[PDB]
Paper text:
The N-terminal domain is commonly referred to as conserved domain-1, or DEAD-domain, and the C-terminal domain as conserved domain-2, or helicase domain.
DDX20, Gemin4 and eIF2C2 form a separate complex that contains numerous miRNAs. The P-loop is in a wide-open conformation when ATP is bound, as seen in DDX20 as well as in the previously published structures of DDX19 and eIF4AIII. This illustrates that DDX20 (and presumably other helicases) can bind ATP also in the absence of divalent cation. However, a divalent cation is needed to allow coordination of three phosphates in the correct geometry for catalysis.
Numbering used by the authors: 62 to 266
The structure:
Amino acid sequence: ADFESLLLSRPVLEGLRAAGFERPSPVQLKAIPLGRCGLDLIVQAKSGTGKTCVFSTIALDSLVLENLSTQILILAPTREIAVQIHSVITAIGIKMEGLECHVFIGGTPLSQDKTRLKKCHIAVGSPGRIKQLIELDYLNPGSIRLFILDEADKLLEEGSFQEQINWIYSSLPASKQMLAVSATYPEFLANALTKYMRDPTFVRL
Ligand SMILES: Nc1ncnc2c1ncn2[C@@H]1O[C@H](COP(=O)(O)OP(=O)(O)NP(=O)(O)O)[C@@H](O)[C@H]1O
């Protein structure tokens, strides 16, 4: 009923408290332990349920802070959502000295992203920019063990980023954990996630 019963690391517990997160929401209670367990998760719950906190907490708890390598990749369907994610992670991560979380979106020179990726624990970005950075080997995906799709319905809908995500998924290490979080779970999304998750655990309220 508090974040302690979820067995999170002390830095994450202290960060949550500092950032105003006093008690977990119903979806946070359910999803966080299962995330810590290393399972592939599909978290489907309506807006207002606390889903960004869910994957942000799982992500920060999983990080090897002393290893300055990109261990976590998070994709978002819009520039604004990518930054929203960065804000939550950097708030919850406030007691983790030297945490490096960076946003990769269009409009910044690729040379600048290359430099930033030299010191980056958690990469958050849009699928097109992330694919370009992996193709250039500016983001070497060799240490990524956690791959998160935020607003997965928006990412994988018709006219969106399925082709780019398929490519990125394939570039990553075979051994990794996947999280997909979404307000809805239509057939197109159920279908698309079969490419990435062999037997996912579902989390709903
Ligand atoms: N358990 C909680 N306790 C207090 N505040 C929370 C909690 N969960 C989320 N919040 C607040 O909401 C912000 C955004 O996180 P969150 O609610 O997880 O994402 P969101 O983008 O609103 N997605 P969702 O809530 O699922 O629609 C945080 O920065 C907090 O200010």
